[PDB]
Amino acid sequence: ENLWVTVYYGVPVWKDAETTLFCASDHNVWATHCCVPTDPNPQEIHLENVTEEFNMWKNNMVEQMHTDIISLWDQSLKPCVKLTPLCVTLQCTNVTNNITDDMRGELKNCSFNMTTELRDKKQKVYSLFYRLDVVQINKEYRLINCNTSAITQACPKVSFEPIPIHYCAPAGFAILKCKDKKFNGTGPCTNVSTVQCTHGIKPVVSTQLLLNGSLAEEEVIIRSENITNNAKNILVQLNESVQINCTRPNNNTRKSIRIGPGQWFYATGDIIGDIRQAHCNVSKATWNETLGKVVKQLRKHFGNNTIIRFANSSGGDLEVTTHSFNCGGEFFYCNTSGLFNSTWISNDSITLPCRIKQIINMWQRIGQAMYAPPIQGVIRCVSNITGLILTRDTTETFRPGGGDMRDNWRSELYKYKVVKIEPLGVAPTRCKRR
Amino acid sequence: ENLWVTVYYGVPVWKDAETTLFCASDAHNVWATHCCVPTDPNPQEIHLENVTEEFNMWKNNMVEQMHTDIISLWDQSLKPCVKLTPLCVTLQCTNVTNNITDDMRGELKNCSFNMTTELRDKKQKVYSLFYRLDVVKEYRLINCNTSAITQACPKVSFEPIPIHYCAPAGFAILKCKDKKFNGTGPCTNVSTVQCTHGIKPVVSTQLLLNGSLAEEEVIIRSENITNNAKNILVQLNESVQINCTRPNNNTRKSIRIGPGQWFYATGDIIGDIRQAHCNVSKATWNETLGKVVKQLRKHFGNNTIIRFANSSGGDLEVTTHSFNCGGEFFYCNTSGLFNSTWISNNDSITLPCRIKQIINMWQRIGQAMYAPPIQGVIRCVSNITGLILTRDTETFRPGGGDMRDNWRSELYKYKVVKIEPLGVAPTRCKRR
Amino acid sequence: NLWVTVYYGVPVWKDAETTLFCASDHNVWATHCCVPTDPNPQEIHLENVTEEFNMWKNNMVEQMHTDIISLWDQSLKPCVKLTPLCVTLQCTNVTNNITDDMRGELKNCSFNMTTELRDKKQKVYSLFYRLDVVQINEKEYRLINCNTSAITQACPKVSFEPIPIHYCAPAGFAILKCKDKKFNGTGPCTNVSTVQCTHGIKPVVSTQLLLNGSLAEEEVIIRSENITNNAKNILVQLNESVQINCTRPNNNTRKSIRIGPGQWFYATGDIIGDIRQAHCNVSKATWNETLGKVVKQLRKHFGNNTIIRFANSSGGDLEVTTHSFNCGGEFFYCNTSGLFNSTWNDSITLPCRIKQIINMWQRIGQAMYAPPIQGVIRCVSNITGLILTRDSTTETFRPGGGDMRDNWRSELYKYKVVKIEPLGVAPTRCKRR
Amino acid sequence: FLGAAGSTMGAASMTLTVQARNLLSGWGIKQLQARVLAVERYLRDQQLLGIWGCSGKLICCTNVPWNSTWSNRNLSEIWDNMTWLQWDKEISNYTQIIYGLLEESQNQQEKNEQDLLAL
Amino acid sequence: GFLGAAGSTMGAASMTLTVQARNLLSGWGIKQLQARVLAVERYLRDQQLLGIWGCSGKLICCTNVPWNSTWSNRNLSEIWDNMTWLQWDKEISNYTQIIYGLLEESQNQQEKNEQDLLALD
Amino acid sequence: FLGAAGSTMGAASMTLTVQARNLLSGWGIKQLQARVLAVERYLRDQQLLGIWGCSGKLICCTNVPWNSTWSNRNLSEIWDNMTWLQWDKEISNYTQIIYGLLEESQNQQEKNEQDLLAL
Ligand SMILES: *[C@@H]1O[C@H](CO)[C@@H](O[C@@H]2O[C@H](CO)[C@@H](O[C@@H]3O[C@H](CO)[C@@H](O)[C@H](O)[C@@H]3O)[C@H](O)[C@H]2NC(C)=O)[C@H](O)[C@H]1NC(C)=O
Ligand SMILES: *[C@@H]1O[C@H](CO)[C@@H](O[C@@H]2O[C@H](CO)[C@@H](O[C@@H]3O[C@H](CO)[C@@H](O)[C@H](O)[C@@H]3O)[C@H](O)[C@H]2NC(C)=O)[C@H](O)[C@H]1NC(C)=O
Ligand SMILES: *[C@@H]1O[C@H](CO)[C@@H](O[C@@H]2O[C@H](CO)[C@@H](O[C@@H]3O[C@H](CO)[C@@H](O)[C@H](O)[C@@H]3O)[C@H](O)[C@H]2NC(C)=O)[C@H](O)[C@H]1NC(C)=O
Ligand SMILES: *[C@@H]1O[C@H](CO)[C@@H](O[C@@H]2O[C@H](CO)[C@@H](O)[C@H](O)[C@H]2NC(C)=O)[C@H](O)[C@H]1NC(C)=O
Ligand SMILES: *[C@@H]1O[C@H](CO)[C@@H](O)[C@H](O)[C@H]1NC(C)=O
Ligand SMILES: *[C@@H]1O[C@H](CO)[C@@H](O)[C@H](O)[C@H]1NC(C)=O
Ligand SMILES: *[C@@H]1O[C@H](CO)[C@@H](O)[C@H](O)[C@H]1NC(C)=O
Ligand SMILES: *[C@@H]1O[C@H](CO)[C@@H](O)[C@H](O)[C@H]1NC(C)=O
Ligand SMILES: *[C@@H]1O[C@H](CO)[C@@H](O)[C@H](O)[C@H]1NC(C)=O
Ligand SMILES: *[C@@H]1O[C@H](CO)[C@@H](O)[C@H](O)[C@H]1NC(C)=O
Ligand SMILES: *[C@@H]1O[C@H](CO)[C@@H](O)[C@H](O)[C@H]1NC(C)=O
Ligand SMILES: *[C@@H]1O[C@H](CO)[C@@H](O)[C@H](O)[C@H]1NC(C)=O
Ligand SMILES: *[C@@H]1O[C@H](CO)[C@@H](O)[C@H](O)[C@H]1NC(C)=O
Ligand SMILES: *[C@@H]1O[C@H](CO)[C@@H](O)[C@H](O)[C@H]1NC(C)=O
Ligand SMILES: *[C@@H]1O[C@H](CO)[C@@H](O)[C@H](O)[C@H]1NC(C)=O
Ligand SMILES: *[C@@H]1O[C@H](CO)[C@@H](O)[C@H](O)[C@H]1NC(C)=O
Ligand SMILES: *[C@@H]1O[C@H](CO)[C@@H](O)[C@H](O)[C@H]1NC(C)=O
Ligand SMILES: *[C@@H]1O[C@H](CO)[C@@H](O)[C@H](O)[C@H]1NC(C)=O
Ligand SMILES: *[C@@H]1O[C@H](CO)[C@@H](O)[C@H](O)[C@H]1NC(C)=O
Ligand SMILES: *[C@@H]1O[C@H](CO)[C@@H](O)[C@H](O)[C@H]1NC(C)=O
Ligand SMILES: *[C@@H]1O[C@H](CO)[C@@H](O)[C@H](O)[C@H]1NC(C)=O
């Protein structure tokens, strides 16, 4: 009867939105990239009496994190030496040395003729290679990727060590965070707070096992888009970490070869001391308890009258059939088949042998290749297993999987949503102009 | 007399201006990865009731803007492609005599050469076919003694699609709707639009293909028709249909150059080897020229003779008609369309064509593109919507020239103006 | 009693560092400095302003340095990389019309190189200066900077002649200028004006002596960060110019060599007529009076009874040991020891050497090849200052520098960039409503 | 900052300056695009408030009557039992109508002011 | 519609100020970004100027600067009707800066006068 | 432009239009950054004046009293005998405190206007 339109500005409302996020932090590629410092104060604002709907599989923050890592990774390799001049026939024989375990035949001693600083001359050089880097054509060999792409040597001073990255909203935007300790992955969430920046997320790249992520507050949280449709990956988050001790035991050196006028190649040099197999150690008791925790929670979706079995998985690609792990400066491909072979019906340790690969084709791309410079000395890493990526095949059987990469970030970004602030609006009041 | 200054904001006035326009499109094409902004169906036009705007197509900066953007786009799309530097070796060539239906006599050649392969320590012997226009028994390619030849990526299409130019904020585009607008001077039926009608970026020579038609009669336009050194653009009232083909069933041979580097060579030809040609309706063409003649006489006098004849600048950019038919480069002989004397007092026309693969485009000579071969048989059917004519009784000939003249045939009705919303006028009030 | 009142448009500022832009009026600084400026001088005088200025740790200097390096490098991007020519050379010591002073200076070098087709070769020859040719470690020679880096040929149509450059503030910023004459690079300055753009500064590249630029208003001005610290340079600005004229008296020819796909290398061709060494002429009387003025104002920091003596350079590469007079496309390395031998007919000549493969800005991963100029070069320029270093009862001064920032501090010392902060608060006898 | 969200409409209006301030304050082309957009969004809202005669205010009262069509709820049951998110959803289909009406009203008001000043 | 009133008389077009104003602020890609920045700068220069003159927030601002017959010696009947804004803009183009300067001076004086009136309480 | 910078504040207060009118009017990434920042700084000041209720004015009086804490100098020695640069040096730490008070005052005033207009 006597109500009039009053216009208000600064109204605390929003809409779901897709915008551009920027990073912040605290010769690393991400330290160079994330030039914006974070505020030591999280500035987290609790929102009382709200029920926000979240969906981790529809979250565009995932696409940006993926896009940003690909872009950064590639940009950092642009101003580097190409190894196109190394795509020549190699003459390779097996390394004869004090070689133990089953490493005999794993390494080869390759000699070849490459370019020099002088256009009129070639030089005879040699280097060591792992079997996984070299393809036989006969003692005649080629590097594996010379038939599809140029191989770029990564710049030796560039560090790809993951450091925490914080994603921050631009002005006019905000990030809502779900604090429900039991959050499903989809649906309404109570105890939602607003933040400016996310917690730091380390851009760790791996398959099968997820290393150095966040832990669940209680039990195991099992999240998948459908569960029923076994084609989807299951992301399993643990409330306890499992420590894994990894090493490359050989004492390596480098042989620096000049290949042109301001360009050089780092060859794997002679091995100092005996040759041993690379491997990872997982405490057995901890691992068996961890699976028991996962299986108990997994049963909630299948029944408490069933059987849960694990498989060693399968595939046509080392990136997914083995545990892809980046330790220090070298890429490991570890055998987890003895880690996932139990069947669950209701001091000791397991050693996982690991293979080392030097020519890397990341992000499942074909047209690009990177040569990982060899690392001097002996390599040791200790990592935290914080979660697993599993797939499913009357007994149910589960196996290690992943490799899409996006799934390695969904596990950290599932609690965040980006919204757009819409500060202008109207409502009826008793107040009239003039 | 107590009159005071009042300030108004939102005043509907403007100034002539130049600015940056952006592209939009409807719905692997080189322009589809550019014109990422959708257009508005029913874009809305606003008629201005009492505006007599002065337009000038030959001073229109939009032509320059369209031209520079096309050149830029063209070059940018060829950057991430395979260079053919490794093919600048000598060739050993013989003629193809394999069921040639006469009149080639070496136009198509069978060549072989020493080129690179997967490893740097190896070489390979390869075979390919070439067209005579691309080749200098010892032969070289025509563009290996200067610049470099880059192979166009087989994955990018250069098919023209409609391009709409749209004004940025603060600007508007005025469209001239007057009947028989001749390119310059005042225009009465002026309307404001946000974007152009959609122009296909066709790159033909001599004849203007797939453009807009005149609605009442043929329109003759030139900057100064009496100068005898300007191109005359002719906008036709009706289209003339032309059927163009390359009848030979070809093949594509894939040759490795290096590490992910591939060359697409012309392979063997299946079936008889025949000449490319275009079929122009004769009756339509005879009527079409008669209409042009009637209109040209309005500028030259009722007692003159137009006299059609062919051009002489034989660099194949001026004397022949370029199409980009199927992405192929035809270079057709149009002299048979222009030899007649008009005095005031099916029987189709067949034009032979000359296929060429190494193209120095946009009259530049510091760059060259190699057009990958197209397998199968090519046919295009298109609409002749206009002509480029020149003159020197006085004789008319097909012209040719810089691309700005083709694009100016569609942008001739549009002008860009800057909106100036702030202004002042007297009024009977005071601030207090 | 007093209420807060807020004002906007308040004439105050803060020290600040921001990005300045280039303003002007086929040069390398053309097309990259497209804002015409100074149609009318500004110079707004600020009465009763005593601002603090500092030549050292200035921001304008760092940007000028940074921008020049960037521009310089950008200009070479589209030109020939001289991928070939690291082949070895077969060189002959040229004696034809050469005097004893230049024996071994020029070499006639022949070599194999590629051509238009990949599997074809050609034999060419050209002349080189001794400075750019090193005997191979294995009559066989190589170019110096060929074994460690690519040499980009300088673009034949790009002029690197310095033109005046004006630096201009972005909106919201202003440049304050110190008009004092006794300022000496630091401290509070009385008579400060505000400008939008600096005076034009010519980006002249040099070492030891400062060439074309401004003169001191009254007397010789000696500026140093710490006059007592022998690790610092002394920039001396003269109040009088000294003319120097340099020449390369050799009627050169150019030999164009085709590389690969129509790329061209411009080789030094033969020499028409007599072959003679490059040199520079400096007026003797002017130079001796100039030093007299420099020492008179220098003794003020050491004592009226101390002895000042001059000496030549201590060591290092030509970039620091010799004068680096830069002519329109040529790099001269001139011997200045003859200018610095005193203790405190009518001309002195300085011998000069010519180098073509240039490593600029003290960098070693890049090199540029300066193509030859035909005919004879004659350069006339003004000496405006010196870069000196110091190292009892007697002090020794020597030519120094080489840090390009020193050649820019000498023009930018009077300017400071400030940020305008128009909002502020004060009390008043005025309350709202 | 959305700290008042979830509180009722009559409570939330107490913080309008908090939300307003934080709207503006907060390869590299990526950041310029983000910054330019933030500015454009800010200005669009300021232009609307200005064109409706609400320049400089966070709360402005107009002369456009409330239509029971848009909402037939009482004053109570809007301001005390609802938050802004709920309100925004209930009348989200009328926003463009209200905005058009507000612009028409301001134009009429300014014309009347000019004619009054004329006396 | 936008510019629909362009051919109408000055006193008719006054009813479409809203329409023109609401469309000014926006209703290789580097050039798109440059265009967006400039559109904002143009918009802001006009808004700043209205602020300086004390016309902020209004489409129609009545000031206290008298009209000079020198700028244009015409009656209201010769301006508000029988004339479009385009014609007017040309007619007084050469006095634009004079008027703008006068408007600035007036507003500055008005602000000082108001501060003094508030003080006298 | 800044001609009054060395002058008495009581004189300098009359050149406010001169400084304000020169704030907007006077390598692609660097130029865009320069332009975007100039705009951003301008808008930050305009938003802030709006929040405090001083939009559209170069000179405004508010309802926040002056505290002796910020300055115990008398009035004559503030407006005379001192420049704005000197005044700025005196009021440095007591800046954000004023801004907070100005915001609080304006919020109370807008609520009061809305309630008064409902009678
Ligand atoms: C999970 O987090 C742990 C702990 O941050 C990661 O292991 C650590 O990796 C760094 C970098 O490789 C090692 O630092 C090294 O220090 C020596 C000097 O002590 C230096 O010479 C090397 O160049 C390097 O900077 C660090 O020692 C190592 N920590 C442990 C306990 O071994 C681990 O890699 C992360 N997991 C994954 C999958 O990335
Ligand atoms: C004038 O416009 C006509 C169309 O109205 C243009 O001809 C058309 O060109 C396209 C592309 O070359 C042809 O489509 C192709 O068809 C094959 C077989 O179906 C397919 O494999 C290709 O991927 C592609 O879709 C289209 O059929 C053809 N239309 C006609 C009637 O022949 C003509 O080229 C334009 N004029 C000029 C000068 O460009
Ligand atoms: C200091 O300033 C003087 C005076 O501006 C500079 O002298 C000028 O130097 C340029 C480049 O060497 C000379 O340009 C050439 O002139 C000939 C004339 O025939 C022309 O054919 C060439 O194409 C080129 O344009 C210019 O003539 C000369 N000016 C005079 C009066 O001699 C001097 O180079 C500056 N010194 C330094 C170190 O920058
Ligand atoms: C374009 O000009 C015509 C006249 O040439 C305008 O027509 C007048 O419209 C008003 C509308 O209220 C009538 O009262 C007049 O009687 C009409 N005059 C004549 C001679 O018919 C027309 O309105 C103008 N266009 C615009 C947009 O204003
Ligand atoms: C993890 O969850 C289990 C659930 O039974 C609980 O017993 C255990 O204490 C939890 N561990 C930690 C570290 O909180
Ligand atoms: C890793 O090595 C440390 C060495 O002190 C040891 O304490 C820890 O238990 C080991 N972890 C595993 C999983 O074996
Ligand atoms: C191809 O035919 C032409 C016909 O004029 C002849 O001149 C040429 O020599 C022939 N080519 C070869 C390799 O025989
Ligand atoms: C030409 O065609 C005939 C059939 O008409 C066929 O027998 C002959 O082999 C063909 N010749 C060539 C060179 O293909
Ligand atoms: C390869 O080079 C040799 C050099 O004698 C030549 O005889 C042979 O014909 C070449 N191969 C090809 C395909 O031209
Ligand atoms: C403008 O449109 C009207 C529509 O009736 C038409 O009669 C008139 O001839 C047109 N004017 C011109 C110059 O084409
Ligand atoms: C048009 O052509 C005539 C021919 O005599 C010439 O005199 C005139 O100058 C030309 N005008 C223009 C504008 O080119
Ligand atoms: C035009 O050319 C044809 C042959 O293509 C010829 O028969 C005809 O007589 C020519 N006509 C004229 C006017 O030259
Ligand atoms: C060059 O040749 C002359 C011949 O008389 C000789 O005296 C001189 O020492 C030679 N110089 C060099 C560097 O070989
Ligand atoms: C070119 O190479 C041949 C290879 O036998 C060699 O004999 C000749 O001396 C070289 N020529 C030059 C100028 O280096
Ligand atoms: C430079 O000027 C400052 C001003 O205080 C003075 O103290 C210093 O001694 C001067 N230095 C020289 C070398 O003249
Ligand atoms: C060249 O330098 C000498 C130095 O003695 C001087 O006398 C002469 O005038 C100078 N020439 C020019 C053109 O300045
Ligand atoms: C949430 O609801 C309770 C009543 O159940 C009320 O007391 C409290 O103030 C509400 N919180 C907010 C933010 O309004
Ligand atoms: C709103 O109006 C309805 C009309 O039927 C009435 O029943 C209801 O009690 C009113 N609610 C309030 C809060 O006044
Ligand atoms: C402005 O001055 C020019 C001087 O040539 C004159 O032509 C023009 O008509 C004048 N405009 C006005 C509005 O008086
Ligand atoms: C500078 O100080 C003198 C002192 O007498 C004063 O008269 C003059 O007005 C002041 N200058 C400015 C710009 O206020
Ligand atoms: C402001 O004035 C009050 C008056 O009671 C005083 O108590 C307080 O200390 C003063 N200063 C500040 C910073 O509040």
Query: What would the DSSP string read from start to end of D2-35?
Result: -TTTTS-HHHHGGGHHHHHHHHHH--THHHHHHH
| D55 located within any domain | yes
d(CA C116, CA C259): 7
> Which of these, C352, C358, C279, lies nearest to C322 by C-alpha position?
C352
Per residue in E92-108, is it b (16+ CB within 10 Å) or e — as a string? beeeeeebbebbbebbb
> Which of these, A324, A343, A345, lies nearest to A333 by C-alpha position?
A324
Tell me the CA–centroid distance for residue C379 and ligand 3, in Å.
6
3-class secondary structure for E18-63?
A: HHHHHCCCCCCCHHHHHHHHHHHHHHHHHHHHHHHCCCCCCCEEEE
Instruction: At D83, give phi and psi (nearest 5°).
Output: -100, 175
Structure tokens, E85: 């804004």
Structure tokens, C230: 């022998």
Are the beta carbons of B192 and E59 closer than 8 angstroms?
Answer: no
Residue type, C372: P
d(CA A256, CA B89): 35
Structure tokens, A214: 């966040």
- Is residue D37 less than 8 Å (CB to CB) from chain F? no
Q: What angle do CA C187, C190, C195 make, to 5 degrees?
A: 95
Nearest CA in chain B to D40: B169
Is the distance from the beta carbon of residue D50 to the nearest atom of ligand 17 less than 6 Å?
no
Instruction: At A399, give phi and psi (nearest 5°).
Output: -140, 155
- Cβ pair F2:C7 closer than 8 A: no
Q: What does the DSSP assignment read for A115-168?
A: E-SSTT-EEEEEEEEEGGGEEE---EEEEGGGGT-PEEEPPTT-B-----BEEE
Q: Where are the beta strands (DSSP E) in A261-395?
A: 263-272, 278-283, 308-310, 323-327, 330-334, 343-344, 349-357, 359-360, 369-371, 377-392
In Å, what is the CA distance from C5 to each residue of A189, E9, F63, F64? 47, 45, 9, 9
d(CA C286, CA D25): 62
Separation of CA E68 from chain center: 17
> Which of these, A323, A64, A287, A363, lies nearest to A210 by C-alpha position?
A323
Q: What is the DSSP letter of A293?
A: H
Rounded to the nearest 10 degrees, the angle between the axes of helix F28-51 and helix D16-25 is 170
> Which of these, B13, B40, B35, lies nearest to B24 by C-alpha position?
B35
Structure tokens, B243: 């059927």
Are the beta carbons of A336 and A322 closer than 8 angstroms?
Answer: yes
Q: What is the DSSP letter of E14?
A: G
CATH, domain range A14-77+150-202+415-420:
2.170.40.20
| Residue identifier of the C-alpha nearest atom 7 of ligand 2 | B380
The torsion of the CA quartet C416, C417, C420, C424, rounded to 10 degrees, works out to -50
Length of chain A: 434
Tell me the CA–centroid distance for residue B49 and ligand 4, in Å.
9
Instruction: At A41, give phi and psi (nearest 5°).
Output: -85, 115
Regarding chains A and E, contact by 3 or more CB pairs under 8 A is answered as no
Pocket test residue of C380, C407, C411 for ligand 3, highest count of atoms within 8 A of CB: C380
Residue type, C46: L
Instruction: At B395, give phi and psi (nearest 5°).
Output: -115, 130
Handedness of CA B212, B216, B220, B224 (dihedral sign): negative
| Residue identifier of the C-alpha nearest atom 11 of ligand 11 | B224
| F27 located within any domain | yes
> Which of these, C250, D56, A236, lies nearest to F113 by C-alpha position?
D56
Handedness of CA A335, A337, A339, A340 (dihedral sign): positive
Q: Looking at chain C, after which residues does the C atom sit over 2.5 Å from the next written N, breaking the chain?
A: 25, 138, 344, 391
Q: What angle do CA A375, A378, A379 make, to 5 degrees?
A: 75
Residue type, B240: V
Are the beta carbons of C174 and C22 closer than 8 angstroms?
Answer: no
Instruction: At A390, give phi and psi (nearest 5°).
Output: -120, 150
HSE, CB side, 13 Å, CA atoms: give it for residue C7: 29
| F76 located within any domain | yes
Is the distance from the beta carbon of residue B98 to the nearest atom of ligand 8 less than 6 Å?
yes
> Which of these, B171, B381, B358, lies nearest to B278 by C-alpha position?
B381
Give strand pairing partners of A357.
A331
Residue type, A293: K
> Which of these, A336, A240, A319, lies nearest to A279 by C-alpha position?
A336
Instruction: At B150, give phi and psi (nearest 5°).
Output: -110, 135
d(CA F119, CA B150): 80
Give strand pairing partners of F59.
C7
Chains in contact with A, counting 3 or more C-beta pairs less than 8 Å apart as contact: B, C, D, F
The three-class DSSP label of residue A362 is: helix
Which residues does a 6 A CB cutoff place in the pocket of ligand 10?
A: B 178-179, 188-189
- Which H or E run includes A74? helix A60-75
d(CA B16, CA B20): 14
- Cβ pair E18:B10 closer than 8 A: yes
Structure tokens, E82: 């029988």
Neighbours of A120 (CB within 10 A): 10
Instruction: Collect all residues of chain D within an 8 Å Cβ-Cβ radius of residue E56.
Output: 50, 55-56
Are the beta carbons of B241 and B381 closer than 8 angstroms?
Answer: yes
> Which of these, A372, F18, A306, lies nearest to C11 by C-alpha position?
F18
Is the distance from the beta carbon of residue C149 to the nearest atom of ligand 15 less than 6 Å?
no
R_g over Cα of chain B: 26
Tell me the CA–centroid distance for residue B228 and ligand 11, in Å.
9
d(CA A132, CA E72): 89
The three-class DSSP label of residue A111 is: strand
Nearest CA in chain B to C262: B146
Give strand pairing partners of B332.
B321, B353
| E8 located within any domain | no
- Is residue A367 less than 8 Å (CB to CB) from chain B? yes
- Is residue E37 less than 8 Å (CB to CB) from chain D? yes
Per residue in E35-51, is it b (16+ CB within 10 Å) or e — as a string? bbbbbbbbbbeebbbbb
The three-class DSSP label of residue A299 is: helix
CATH, domain range C1-83+153-203+406-433:
2.170.40.20
CATH number for domain B4-81+156-423, candidates 3.30.390.50, 1.10.10.10, 2.130.10.10, 2.170.40.20: 2.170.40.20
d(CA B270, CA B251): 8
Structure tokens, D114: 């000019």
Instruction: Collect all residues of chain F within an 8 Å Cβ-Cβ radius of residue E34.
Output: 28, 32
d(CA B23, CA B33): 11
Minimal C-alpha gap between E51 and chain F (Å): 5
Rounded to the nearest 10 degrees, the angle between the axes of helix D29-51 and helix D16-25 is 140
Handedness of CA B405, B409, B411, B414 (dihedral sign): positive
Burial of D2 (0-12, 13-18, 19+ CB in 10 A): buried
> Which of these, B244, E73, D34, B61, lies nearest to A36 by C-alpha position?
D34
- Is residue F102 less than 8 Å (CB to CB) from chain C? yes
In Å, what is the CA distance from B36 to each residue of B22, B32, B66, B201, C254? 10, 7, 17, 16, 51
R_g over Cα of chain C: 26
- Which H or E run includes F87? helix F84-90
d(CA C118, CA D22): 64
- Is residue B80 less than 8 Å (CB to CB) from chain A? no
| F2 located within any domain | no
| Residue identifier of the C-alpha nearest atom 12 of ligand 9 | B113
Separation of CA B350 from chain center: 22
- Is residue C5 less than 8 Å (CB to CB) from chain F? yes
Experimental technique of record: cryo-EM
Nearest CA in chain C to F56: C8
Domain span including residue F48: 9-116
d(CA A168, CA A38): 9
Instruction: Collect all residues of chain E within an 8 Å Cβ-Cβ radius of residue F62.
Output: none
Per residue in B251-287, is it b (16+ CB within 10 Å) or e — as a string? bebebbbbbbbebbbbbebeeebbbbbbbbbeebbee
Structure tokens, A396: 């149910």
Structure tokens, C397: 């001064």
The three-class DSSP label of residue F55 is: coil
The three-class DSSP label of residue A96 is: coil
Are the beta carbons of B411 and B196 closer than 8 angstroms?
Answer: yes
Is the distance from the beta carbon of residue B86 to the nearest atom of ligand 12 less than 6 Å?
no
Structure tokens, A184: 């499903």
Q: What angle do CA A64, A67, A71 make, to 5 degrees?
A: 135
- Cβ pair E37:F32 closer than 8 A: yes
| F107 located within any domain | yes
Q: Which of B68, B187, B427 to mutate to test the interface with E (most CBs of E within 10 A)?
A: B427
Tell me the CA–centroid distance for residue D56 and ligand 21, in Å.
30
Looking at chain F from residue 42 to 101, which residues have their Cβ under 8 Å from any Cβ of chain C? 42, 45, 48-49, 52-54, 57-66, 71, 75, 78-79, 83-85, 87-88, 91, 95, 98, 101
Q: Are strands A166-168 and B149-151 parallel, antiparallel or unpaired?
A: unpaired
Structure tokens, D115: 């004619």
Q: Looking at chain F, after which residues does the C atom sit over 2.5 Å from the next written N, breaking the chain?
A: 26
d(CA A95, CA A93): 6
Pocket test residue of E94, E95, E96, E98 for ligand 19, highest count of atoms within 8 A of CB: E94
Neighbours of C308 (CB within 10 A): 19
Neighbours of B139 (CB within 10 A): 17
Q: Which residues contact B145 (CB under 8 A, 6 or more apart)?
A: C116, C261, C262
Instruction: At C321, give phi and psi (nearest 5°).
Output: -85, -20
3-class secondary structure for chain B?
A: CCCEEEEEECCCCEEECCCCCEEEECCCECCCCCCCCECCCCCCEEECCCCCEEEEHHHCHHHHHHHHHHHHHHHHHCCCCCECHHHCCCEEEEECCCCECCCCCCCEEEEEEEEECCCCCCEEEEEEEEEHHHECCEECECCCCCCCEEECCCCCECCCCCEEEECCCCEEEEEECCCCCCCEEEECCEEEECECCCECCCCCCCEEECCCCCCCCCEEECCCCCCCCCCEEEEEEEEEEEEEEEEEEECEEEEEEECCEEEEEECCCECCECCCEEEECHHHHHHHHHHHHHHHHHHHCCCCCCCECCCCCCCCCCCEECCCECCECCCEECHHHCCECCCCCCCCEEEEECCCCEECHHHCCCCEEECCCCCEEEEEEEEEEEEEEEECCCCEEECCCCCHHHHHHHHCCEEEEEECCEEEEEECCCCC
Instruction: Collect all residues of chain B within an 8 Å Cβ-Cβ radius of residue D118.
Output: 427-429
Q: Are strands B138-139 and B349-352 parallel, antiparallel or unpaired?
A: unpaired
| Residue identifier of the C-alpha nearest atom 4 of ligand 9 | B114
Structure tokens, B426: 């007297």
Distance between start and end Cα atoms, chain F: 49
Instruction: At A349, give phi and psi (nearest 5°).
Output: -155, 160
Q: Which residues contact B237 (CB under 8 A, 6 or more apart)?
A: B213, B214, B215, B216, B217, B218, B291
> Which of these, C198, C242, C253, lies nearest to C58 by C-alpha position?
C198
Nearest listed ligand to the Cα of residue D73: 18
The structural domain count of chain E equals: 1
- Cβ pair C88:A261 closer than 8 A: no
Are the beta carbons of C372 and C132 closer than 8 angstroms?
Answer: no
Q: What angle do CA C210, C213, C216 make, to 5 degrees?
A: 90
Q: Are strands A140-143 and A308-310 parallel, antiparallel or unpaired?
A: unpaired
